[PDB]
Design a binder for this molecule. Structure first.
Ligand SMILES: [Zn+2]
Lengths: 73, 33
């Protein structure tokens, strides 16, 4: 399946993922497509920040869902 | 569009292949037999 990751700036990114993927797996996929260090990444889904070590399904994130990327920087 | 975690008052969503647990509750289950 596939989801969208949206920075605050506006830039959108499409990711191909499995519901089994951990938040770390996803932060890693972003570091690839956008060279950001996963320690700088804070992912947010429907107002909740995604906690490390849990999976997309644990959050009921389904195909075409939208996460926002915030940064610690 | 799925189903909550089989365990007590768990905030997360389970999955059939995890006998209905979220990922970490499932590991907890597995670790206890
Ligand atoms: Zn649980």
């Amino acid at each position: 399946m596939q989801i969208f990751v949206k920075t605050l700036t506006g830039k959108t990114i499409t990711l191909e993922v499995e519901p089994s993927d951990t938040i770390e797996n996803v932060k890693a996929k972003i570091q690839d497509k956008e060279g950001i260090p996963p320690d700088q990444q804070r992912l947010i889904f429907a107002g909740k920040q995604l906690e490390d070590g849990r999976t997309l399904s644990d959050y009921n994130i389904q195909k075409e869902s939208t996460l926002h990327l915030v940064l610690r920087l | 569009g799925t189903s909550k975690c089989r365990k007590a008052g768990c905030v997360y969503f389970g999955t059939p292949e995890n006998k209905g647990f979220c990922t970490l509750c499932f590991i907890e289950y597995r670790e206890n037999k």
